[PDB]
Design a protein around this ligand. Sequence first.
Ligand code: NAG
Lengths: 201, 225
Amino acid sequence: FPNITNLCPFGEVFNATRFASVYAWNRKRISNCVADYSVLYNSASFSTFKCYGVSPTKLNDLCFTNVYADSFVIRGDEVRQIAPGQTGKIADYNYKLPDDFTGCVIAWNSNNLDSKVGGNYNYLYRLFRKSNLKPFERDISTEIYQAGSTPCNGVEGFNCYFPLQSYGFQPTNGVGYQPYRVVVLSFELLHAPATVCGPKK
Amino acid sequence: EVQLLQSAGGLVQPGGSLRLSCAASGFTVSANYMSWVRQAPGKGLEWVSVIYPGGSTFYADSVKGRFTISRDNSKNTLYLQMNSLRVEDTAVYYCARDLSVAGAFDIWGQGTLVTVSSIVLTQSPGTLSLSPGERATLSCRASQSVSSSYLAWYQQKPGQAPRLLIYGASSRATGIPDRFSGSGSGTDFTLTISRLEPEDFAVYYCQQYGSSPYTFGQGTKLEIK
Ligand SMILES: *[C@@H]1O[C@H](CO)[C@@H](O)[C@H](O)[C@H]1NC(C)=O
């Protein structure tokens, strides 16, 4: 490898400004650059760096073919449902983890940066669906989930309910009712020659 | 005309096997949340089980593993198999659909009775015996201080099934008269009935959702001095 290809845009994933809600999860593939992971385990702001897969110490000795960073804003104690195989209101009709999700998951802490005195009403989450989502899949089609057998041509009423409900965020204690931020780094195994190794000599 | 019929009124031998049944009357069970709750006579209500669309199963904290709830779309049933049953498990086993965010337990079943061998939520006021012609105040406090709209209210009736009064502490359910009001925020909520009517003397409960296993209040009965 040459001296340095380019600094990875990976810092922007952690310290960007605007994030997407859980219903529309956003992704970003990291292109060819020298891996910069030494600044992760040394930071004290991280408190949920628990992840199953490769060792959390031999990060500079890895050459995964391609890496993705996925971001969402699931709130509070709902984070723990992200694990190698779980079910629930979040990992049923939203972000789902397979048994081969090699990589790691990172959680943040919420503050006045993502909050409002009046409240937040621009954040949505899926609550009604008809089947479990396949891993790493999204379903964006929101008219009616047809709870009843009556026609649901688009009239709000009995047996025809909306499938999306807005989050409600207010300044509170914050144990499990704050807009936490969760990102997932996902690695691939082998489809192309390795490009993101991080040696220097 | 949604109806939920049940048939479980049978005495059970010690360590016996029973099978309850909840049917449907127009709405498919494969597209909506379902829940089984325990009445626990002599005390407040409590939670038993929840089935999501899909078919993931959530059980209460007191009981682990032994409860076996099953869903049958072929006959449109919400079966629950009671295995070997121990002491202090005699209560009613209501079943109801769940729309927690938008309307909490709008329609319930009818109830049953199973015999035996041979978040900190509290509600303050109490009986508060009064007379018709004025209003009243019912206060429901909480220890966790749920933020905005995850608390609802229910009304009991002797021999009947629980009904819905207000969902999310902001708007009442359909068919509710305009004499019921609710307010409050932060830690406690207040509910008021104006122009008391003879068809209003009933026990009121406050329930919390959108959190750890759902909890109801102990019970506030209204009586005439
Ligand atoms: C964002 O925050 C991290 C850690 O708090 C810091 O290292 C970085 O310089 C900040 N800015 C950017 C653009 O990443």
